[PDB]
Symmetry: none
């Protein structure tokens, strides 16, 4: 990868690695600001199967406009003498992932967890009202900024009509919809609350199997300082049948809000 893309974006340190792409902190020398640039790993920039796969993801990136969603600024294709190198330029978030927080700091307090997840529900809801399912909600895809704001990254591109955060339907290979993001957000909620996701296993298959077939253990049975109410919410978000989950991320956030307040939630009492 070159030091500069398009004589505009000056690549700096790696923020994170993804499937085929890596995200860099960079200076937009033209707009004079720091940005995040997602590029295709240089080695992979010759396999056409990858160049094409990435360019569609870039061309068709979810460009949503919401405080809790990392914006998309620009998309491009640079010119290293070796070859054309495709990239997406995005909002930069000076912060750390939920995955890092949970790992270095452990489970959050119920109050903090609720604030974080309800804020994620807003990003998800705004995304949903705009026709877009994230499909990969998970702690590594939720960012917390230095000033403590939630920023969600890595929305999947629109479609036609590991495994710790899959919904039963993705696991079965059935069709997914907004409710599917709901289930996954609940997995994250479960983890920030208890230090662990609902299901663990020796292999993605095992975990997938559990999502589809095993009853989750109520969070309070795995960590202290969790109320029965809060249990009911998490458990509803984790319902096996989409028909029985929260129907929208809004519904989910409203029940989270009630628990923050200390009011009984609309969720069932197990």
């Amino acid at each position: 990868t070159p030091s500069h893309l398009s004589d505009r974006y000056e690549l700096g340190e790696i923020l994170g690695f993804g499937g085929m792409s890596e995200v860099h902190l960079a200076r937009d020398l033209r707009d004079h600001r720091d940005v995040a640039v997602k590029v295709l790993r240089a080695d992979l920039a010759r396999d056409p199967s990858f160049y094409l796969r990435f360019r569609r993801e870039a061309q068709n990136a979810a460009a949503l406009n919401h405080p809790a969603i990392v914006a998309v600024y620009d998309t491009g294709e640079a010119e290293t003498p070796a070859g054309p190198l495709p990239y997406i330029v995005m909002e930069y978030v000076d912060g750390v992932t939920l995955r890092d927080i949970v790992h270095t700091e452990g489970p959050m307090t119920p109050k903090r967890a609720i604030e974080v997840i309800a804020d994620a529900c807003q990003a998800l809801n705004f995304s949903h009202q705009n026709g877009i399912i994230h499909r990969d909600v998970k702690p590594a895809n939720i960012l917390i900024s230095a000033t403590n704001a939630v920023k969600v990254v890595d929305f999947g591109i629109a479609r036609a009509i590991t495994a710790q955060y899959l919904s039963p339907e993705q696991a079965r290979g059935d069709s997914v919809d907004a409710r599917s993001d709901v289930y996954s957000l609940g997995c994250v909620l479960y983890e920030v609350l208890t230090g662990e996701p609902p299901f663990t296993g020796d292999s993605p298959v095992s975990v997938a199997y559990q999502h589809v077939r095993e009853d989750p253990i109520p969070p309070s049975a795995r960590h202290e300082g969790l109320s029965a109410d809060l249990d009911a919410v998490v458990l509803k978000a984790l319902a096996k049948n989409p028909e029985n989950r929260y129907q929208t991320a809004a519904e989910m956030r409203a029940d989270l809000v009630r628990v923050h307040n200390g009011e009984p939630p609309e969720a069932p009492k197990v």
Copy 2:
């Protein structure tokens, strides 16, 4: 695209097989003047910390077992070139093929051969268990047959911590064909699991298919949990009711009903091999 050399001692050659994070190379040991197998982190995953860490742990904690039917571990290290550090493990080399390639190119074995092979796998797993090591991933791709027909087992899981429960602590889209029920549920895995998995392999070398197949790993995992396996002799000819009894005991849903040890399973495979009645329920 890895380097040509490691630690100025091992020069790498053809790839023998690829795994999760890692590729296995046939290499020449320039100090000891011999061919070894070298399992290294894939070069493209090397900048990535979560893969480097995951592998460093695997390399340092590799299971060194000393047994004819187990591929030895010679050295464990970290090479530092401008792509590394690249933890790696140096192992006994087996000039041979996987039990998986065999079944795929040659078809099912004869009971006489199947039994001999699985019986040797049993001696490997028994030895390992008696050394506190559970394999956890027994499957055709992890059993090699040497050019002289010796059985050699690879890819033992690293030792893990056991909880207050007396259960094993869990570690870490796939095969799902050799999964035990306890693995599927994410329960405690132990010697009985290896026994069950080896059962699946035995079933596969005898009949040409593992006990359960399906169009999703999830759905196969389910069959392991809930569904009865059809006796081998109903799927392939030339197999006796006694052989069925042994395979089906190994494949039992409740670990308390399987062979409790690999040596026990080996004992019933030897009896069948000899024309004796097995200790296992008629069916």
